[PDB]
């Protein structure tokens, strides 16, 4: 699976027919159609930098994975009664600065998007159990607007040189990804899906109102990762953002 013409978002529905389901992600958030929900509590994140484990080139992207054997690193609040356990963060980007976010806001496309992913450790005992459950996953999305270089990305960007080709992996330790979140945690929430196969409709999306910055040159560092395995002809990871999907009657709630 990838973002090419023959393995990309338009091809996913042949093995994953949920791609055409009613709770698919990402979406365009129309702010005139959001419903302010008074019952939404503030997002609370409390992550232990010691849970940072590994950075991996997965061919179409890179993932930073976390130790998830215990509740050292948790998300609570917002729409949730259950505590969610941090397990990964990653980014999405586009071929040029003009697009690359997954979510849009009032049709506006940003240059990239951060995803911070968690699984419901109150109700389930593993990511594998949680992955397919309607209440199983919680992902914070942060829209990334091209502009000033973001110094909080530095450890992540410095690590990429050790995972240049598909399947390379390296230790990635002592990192608290709450340092990447915007200063305001005002958010939108809706019920949706993984944005990559297998596209399970198991994700409660938390989309931050406030963007964070990224430079043109930092985006170029993402696009210079290689989708090929070592020794093959180099094939840059140009883009990995899924198009926005129909809301199909879902309501986006606003904390603000
Ligand atoms: N983009 S996203 O909706 O945040 C997302 C994307 C992926 C992905 N992207 N590439 N490969 N996997 C993912 N992988 C881990 C899994 C969890 C459960 C089953 S597989 C988890 C999340 Cl939440
Ligand atoms: Zn993602």
From Swiss-Prot:
Protein's UniProt keywords contain Cytoplasm: yes
Known regulation of activity: Activated by histamine, imidazole, L-adrenaline, L- and D-histidine, and L- and D-phenylalanine. Inhibited by coumarins, sulfonamide derivatives such as acetazolamide, benzenesulfonamide and derivatives (4-carboxyethylbenzene-sulfonamide, 4-carboxyethylbenzene-sulfonamide ethyl ester, 4-(acetyl-2-aminoethyl)benzene-sulfonamide, 4-aminoethylbenzene-sulfonamide), and 'prong inhibitors' BR15, BR17, BR22 and BR30. Activated by a short exposition to Foscarnet (phosphonoformate trisodium salt), but inhibited by a long one. Esterase activity weakly reduced by cyanamide.
All copies of domain Alpha-carbonic anhydrase, residue ranges: 1-256
Cellular compartments annotated: Cytoplasm
Entry cofactors: Zn(2+)
EC number annotated for this UniProt entry: 4.2.1.1, 4.2.1.69
Key words, A-Z: Acetylation, Cytoplasm, Lyase, Metal-binding, Zinc
Top-level taxon of origin: Eukaryota
Residues at which Zn(2+) 1 binds: 90, 92, 115
Binding locations of Zn(2+) 2: 60, 63, 196
One Gene Ontology molecular-function label: carbonate dehydratase activity
Presence of keyword Cytoplasm: yes
Enzyme superclass (EC): lyase
A Pfam family recorded for this sequence: Carb_anhydrase
One cellular component term from this protein's GO annotations in UniProt: cytoplasm
Family: Belongs to the alpha-carbonic anhydrase family.
Protein name, per record: Carbonic anhydrase 1
Organism: Homo sapiens
Lineage of the organism: Eukaryota, Metazoa, Chordata, Craniata, Vertebrata
